[PDB]
Design a binder for this molecule. Structure first.
Ligand SMILES: *[C@@H]1O[C@H](CO)[C@@H](O)[C@H](O)[C@H]1NC(C)=O
Ligand SMILES: *[C@@H]1O[C@H](CO)[C@@H](O)[C@H](O)[C@H]1NC(C)=O
Ligand SMILES: *[C@@H]1O[C@H](CO)[C@@H](O)[C@H](O)[C@H]1NC(C)=O
Ligand SMILES: *[C@@H]1O[C@H](CO)[C@@H](O)[C@H](O)[C@H]1NC(C)=O
Lengths: 836, 836
């Protein structure tokens, strides 16, 4: 009664007759696309009890309650899911109740029951009892809930004996259809199943059983079904068949291609009767039991149903991702594409062995077959007419095959053809004949000497750099006077150039399959005089970066073809530096402590050389005489006037252009600025301390409260010859001498006529910045009166005067205003004024 | 004393000695880059009173108050601004007060006084009095306001002498420096200026005057200064010189040049002596009295200081934007670039005439010179060695020059040279020897039949389409069995194809880079049997396009070169029913009125046709017998449970990929769905009304409250042969018959034992949807009691019963529950029950 594999039924009812003998469908089931709606409940399948894989119903016109069709379906194992679901009820025409009243558990996956016009009864199905991970149920698109009309026993429906369960605060009835309920085993069983009338089943059991605690009575087992018994594990000498049972070796190996393409054999590995042996293992020949570990080719086979898997785009190779051996032949016709190689090395650079030929055709977008790295041997079993097993035709742009210094290859059962590839010279294939054991397979016509590699120089010479010279933004370079076999041949020179901090760079990469793409181009012609060797003036170059350069003599390949040698000097690299750095960046600092200033900045933007060191000058700056001449005791001044949470909150992109224009205009101001800021350049002393390597430093031994102007010059290695960079500067203050703002000596009080008192006192020894004013607080009972004394006032009188005071005793105090802030109040000053 | 042009001073003080005689600097002034700080207030220039243009001070070390150096600077005209400013004080080293105490008004532009370390006194300058559009003033970066120290006469100690003005709620003093204030003319003058001690000046006046209301006494005029008098307009026979005066024509022409100057001689136009005459007009020789309109685009010279303005990039041509005639020669070396042409037609497609030669070299990124449209004649005054005035060298990809069906050209004073252009066929240049009057000017060597157009592509024939078989997503196309001069030549056939709804299409639209990227390539080989003419099966074509096609016979050009004839069929434009048609989309509708329903949808996605028509089938759908058998008087049901928008951003759904897989799985379901939803297809009746051309329609004559199922078919031009397309559908309800829910007949009451009352009544004639229940409201004094009667209850009894009522009289009412909603209440029903 074990129907397998999964069953498919569409377009009509009568195919249902194939399910008469099926009890546990070993696979999935499709009952779909039945538009006729011809028949009704004349097909019934009580035997069907469990589906191993998912279920899918769709457009089964004329179906109203699945419980009519499939009763007894206790559990769905759902080992293979639809997408992540084990039951798909998509847009059902006329289904009214889901039925499935005998359905008890869904081991795997979720369900999707949407778009059903008139379907209902989904709500009262507490899938928590039946299904874990219930949150993934997708039942949105069906009938609106108000028109659902969900009624069923217990909740005021006939045969009311439904039970009440709770899911998220809803302790109420559960059910399946109008007639019948949704019952669940009591907690007495725990995880164990049960039967009708609450008789608890066997532990190794699930869904239901015929008698309490009987191995053979179980309608469905819990984990594995074998020998008509539910077992917790596969018995010895038996191997787990997929899903829910064990089988003998002989059964595991006898099964062959039936219905779907089973194919010969069915492996056994790790104690399980699997289909094909897992990674890191290989089945012992055709002996259908065993495995042994392997690597590389063994882990994966790259065969294709097509004998010729041709590739015309990166996506065309997707199926070949992570594969090694193709049991067939290859064919490439990739005409256009950029970045394609970087993805060909990934999709199908793992290819190792090939059972046939390989062919390359009209591959204008490719320049080097090096992207085929893993290939080691070619069989040639499948070979082209003329016995050609490696065909390369009409490739205008191909340069050179696999790197032939360390990489080996072999073509076993055929020859190769080459033609119509003017950038691939014979030197790249003549060596291959040595390396793939194929020197004598073919004549020289199969690799024609006329149209192959015609354009390719093969080989270019190397020019000599007669002189070089750097600047701060410019480099002047020259080369030997190249003299071809016929001088009229050469017509010009090109002087490539680009920033290349790292020597790991070569122009033969082909840039954009040749030139362009970040090798900035410039040209210059040979000067008319034959006595002056070529030179140019590259300029505007970014300071502080190593610059690779090479020279190519563009020539005219005609008449004699390869005899036109071509010319290309070595890839020299030159520093920018006859140069003067472009000042620091992001200069900042603070005063962690008095006499201490921590200074930290960021590297200069265009510093004209390479990492050598920095230089910092700092000068004590004057306390402006301005503030001295001011009586702050009377000055008061007056102020004058006239995605982000901001939501959309845009700003004119033309306003960003305006800001760009303003910044650019400022920078051009700076450019015209620093021309005569430093003409041609081939009250305190300045203190200097050259930083070594890093963008940080600290200066000590500074006055507690003196402001410092900090010039910060970036100086390069060539700074000795051509001076140092211009100056970015910043001013900063030290942390005030703490407690230096308190009074150093006592106060003195003297009587004066008209009930007056003169107060005198000493002055701070080392005031922090400056003493702006003195705040005398005094009074008879409470020191309410507060008066101000300017520094000049104190200087003139050594203090101040208070006039017209009332009779009585008095206490007073004084505080100073340091440029750092308030000073400490004076100690109490006791005095008295007599009425007469 | 009129110093001109603008004055420039840098790097030292002694250059200030060029300002003794300068009263009104006719131009701008730069006093910048003075780092020496050598001298102090020994240079004084009381004469300087006004600057016509902006002023720029920067890096003037040793300067502390500008007012000392330049007193009496009454007004700045600022006709030409720095950026949009007439005064720039950027990083003023040591300036303390801006001075400018005698500065009163700024005519044009704003000021930028920023990032000065110690500058102050900006606040007390009410720029509203001096400056309009004052908002653009930008003074952010200078000394912090707290350390500014902004004080001046009056506001400090001494009796006030500055006047009080108000800007944005601050009515207080205004001033310039510590020694002097910022005085302004009283409102008595209105817009008129004034003198000291408040004597009002002349109307035609500004800044200041020496006596009240005197033309000759004005320190500065208001609009124009001429003949030692301020005037509101230029006097007749005199012509406005730039800015602030008039001049005689003799002077206008005698101003030849000085350092930075052009004309030599200024022209009088529109009543003003300008440098050059404006657009649409031409100077007639050396004439300077007047300027006459020219006519068309003559008025734009495109000369360059360089005799050879070479272009290597689009930006390299920027300066030539909007220009017509180049007084020199052209040189192009644009090797790489895409979209470049579309911008060359803009930057330099306006070029009309050229005074010399033109040269093209190494232009691999260009294929057609049509982008130079406006050129009509070439002079050749500047000519190359060998008298070559038009040179085209080393251009691999050039195909064809300007369009020669209608566009003319002439080269006057030289010949032309070509070479190394294999894709430019000689036909494009042989015609030129006719069109530019140069047929015999040069030998054929300069136009050698060799390397010139060497490769190109011969001359294409046209293939013939033997048959064009079709499908609903697939085309099968063929062509005559092409027979080259030598059969081994041809090696394959490529079949270009793309979607091209519009006839405006040609070969080079989207092929590759130079051909652009829109033509989806494919290749196919001739079948082995010579008796079967070539054919291909194109497939998977997106519906709704006139699917363009063409054929090119790829060959092996060699040995005989041009004799290799090549080929290309016509650009046929096969369309749908080659892609035979399909289904609808996007269905929506509503019911504005009873028996009326508006239907509107959108154009379909995949119908494989063209606008032909739509079809809509609507079927009355059943009022489910389900709801009939349900007593809703007692049914209650039970629910179950368990910088942009990120100002309120909920989340970022980076799972867009996961939605991608789910949606794509949905479409794969749909594809395997409609594969066999409709097998091979080469209680109410359905009603039909084919729509004509649009995506809208309406249905009438429908039951007031019946639900309708609407199938929609994208029936089309060829729906007759291969059937109509799949049916998207939707259900919708009509608007209920309003007022049909009220009772049609009276109620009747009867006595019954046990103090009971039986109520009977008629039933609605045409209920909307269905009558679910009846709400009887009744009571003795107030109809408090409300009871429910099901439709089946009424059917069985024609009404209902009330039992065990108290003695007394009673009034009652009844309301019906239509599927559309509540019905109208019954008229009052009067009855009574007696205790016995
Ligand atoms: C079911 O089994 C019976 C008995 O072997 C057989 O006659 C019948 O054809 C089978 N039908 C199906 C659908 O398996
Ligand atoms: C379904 O059965 C398995 C194994 O017996 C059990 O672990 C799972 O809990 C059951 N379903 C639910 C929803 O618990
Ligand atoms: C100013 O004018 C006087 C008198 O003509 C002349 O001697 C002197 O050189 C002039 N200086 C300048 C800077 O124009
Ligand atoms: C400057 O003078 C012009 C013309 O006399 C006048 O229109 C303008 O208002 C003056 N400046 C201000 C700020 O008003």
């Amino acid at each position: 009664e074990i129907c397998g594999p999964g069953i498919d039924i569409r377009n009509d009812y009568q195919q249902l007759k194939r399910l008469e003998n099926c009890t546990v469908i070993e696979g999935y089931l499709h009952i779909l696309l039945i538009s006729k709606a011809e028949d009704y409940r004349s097909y019934r399948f009580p035997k069907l009890t469990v589906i191993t894989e998912y279920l899918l119903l769709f457009r089964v016109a004329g179906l109203e309650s699945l419980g009519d069709l499939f009763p007894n379906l206790t559990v769905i194992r759902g080992w293979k899911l639809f997408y992540n679901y084990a039951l798909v009820i998509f847009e059902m025409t006329n289904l009214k109740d889901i039925g499935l009243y005998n359905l008890r558990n869904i081991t795997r996956g979720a369900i999707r029951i949407e778009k059903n016009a008139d379907l209902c009864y989904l709500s009262t199905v507490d899938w928590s009892l039946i299904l874990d991970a219930v949150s993934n149920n997708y039942i949105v698109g069906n009938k609106p809930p108000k028109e659902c009309g969900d009624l069923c026993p217990g909740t005021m429906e006939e045969k009311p004996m439904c039970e009440k369960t709770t899911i998220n605060n809803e302790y109420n009835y559960r059910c399946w259809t109008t007639n019948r309920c949704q019952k669940m085993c009591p907690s007495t069983c725990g995880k164990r199943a049960c039967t009708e009338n609450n008789e608890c089943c066997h532990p190794e059991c699930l869904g239901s059983c015929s008698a309490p605690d009987n191995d053979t009575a179980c309608v469905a087992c819990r984990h594995y079904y074998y020998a008509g018994v539910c077992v917790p594990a596969c018995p010895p000498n038996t191997y787990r068949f997929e899903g829910w049972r064990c089988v003998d070796r002989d059964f595991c190996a006898n099964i062959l291609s039936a219905e779907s393409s089973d194919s010969e054999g069915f492996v056994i590995h790790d104690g399980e009767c699997m289909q094909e042996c897992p990674s890191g293992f290989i089945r012992n020949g055709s002996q259908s039991m065993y495995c042994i570990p392997c690597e590389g080719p063994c882990p994966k086979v790259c065969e294709e149903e097509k004998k010729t898997k041709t590739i015309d785009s990166v996506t065309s190779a997707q199926m070949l991702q992570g594969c090694t051996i193709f049991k067939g032949n290859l064919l490439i016709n990739i005409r256009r594409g950029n970045n394609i190689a970087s993805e060909l090395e990934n999709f199908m650079g793992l290819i190792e062995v090939v059972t046939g030929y390989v062919k390359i055709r009209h591959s204008h977008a490719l320049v080097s077959l090096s992207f085929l790295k893993n290939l080691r041997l070619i069989l040639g079993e499948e070979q082209l007419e003329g016995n050609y097993s490696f065909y390369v035709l009409d490739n205008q742009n191909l340069q050179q095959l696999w790197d032939w210094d360390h990489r080996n290859l072999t073509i076993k059962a055929g020859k190769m053809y080459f033609a119509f590839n003017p950038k691939l010279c014979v030197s790249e294939i003549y060596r291959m004949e040595e390396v793939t054991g194929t020197k004598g397979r073919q004549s020289k016509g199969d690799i024609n000497t006329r149209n192959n590699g015609e354009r390719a120089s093969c080989e270019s010479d190397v020019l000599h750099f007669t002189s070089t010279t750097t600047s701060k933004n410019r480099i002047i370079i020259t080369w030997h006077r190249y003299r071809p076999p016929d001088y009229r041949d050469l017509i010009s020179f090109t002087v490539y150039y680009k920033e290349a901090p790292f020597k790991n760079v070569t122009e033969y990469d082909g840039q954009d399959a040749c030139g362009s793409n970040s090798w900035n181009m410039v040209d210059v012609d040979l000067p008319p005089n034959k006595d002056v060797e070529p030179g140019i003036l590259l300029h505007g170059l970014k300071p502080w970066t190593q610059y690779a350069v090479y020279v190519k003599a563009v020539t005219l390949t005609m008449v004699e073809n390869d005899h036109i040698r071509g010319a290309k000097s070595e890839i020299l690299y030159i520093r920018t530096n006859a140069s003067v750095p472009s000042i620091p960046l992001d200069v900042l600092s603070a005063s962690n402590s008095s006499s201490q200033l921590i200074v930290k900045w960021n590297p200069p933007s265009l510093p004209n050389g390479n990492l050598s060191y920095y230089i910092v000058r700092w000068q004590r700056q004057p306390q402006d005489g301005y503030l001295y001449r001011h009586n702050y005791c009377s000055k008061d001044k007056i102020p004058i006037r006239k995605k982000g949470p901001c939501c959309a909150c845009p700003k004119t992109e033309a306003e960003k252009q305006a800001e760009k224009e303003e910044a650019e205009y400022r920078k051009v101001f700076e450019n015209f600025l620093h021309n005569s800021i430093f003409v041609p350049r081939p009250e305190y002393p300045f203190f200097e301390s050259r930083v070594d390597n890093k963008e940080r430093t600290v200066i000590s031994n500074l006055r507690p409260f003196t402001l410092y102007r900090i010039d910060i010059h970036s100086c390069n290695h060539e700074a000795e010859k051509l001076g140092c960079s211009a100056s970015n500067f910043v001013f900063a203050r030290t942390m005030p001498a703490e407690g230096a703002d308190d009074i150093p000596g006592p106060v003195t009080w003297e009587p004066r006529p008209e009930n007056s008192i003169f107060l005198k006192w000493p002055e701070p020894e080392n005031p922090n910045g400056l003493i702006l004013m003195y705040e005398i607080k005094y009074g008879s009972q409470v020191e309410d009166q507060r008066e101000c004394v300017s520094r000049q006032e104190y200087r003139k009188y050594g203090g101040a005067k208070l006039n017209r005071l009332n009779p009585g005793n008095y206490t007073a105090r004084i505080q100073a205003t340091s440029l750092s802030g308030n000073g400490s109040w004076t100690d109490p000053v006791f005095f008295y004024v007599q009425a007469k």
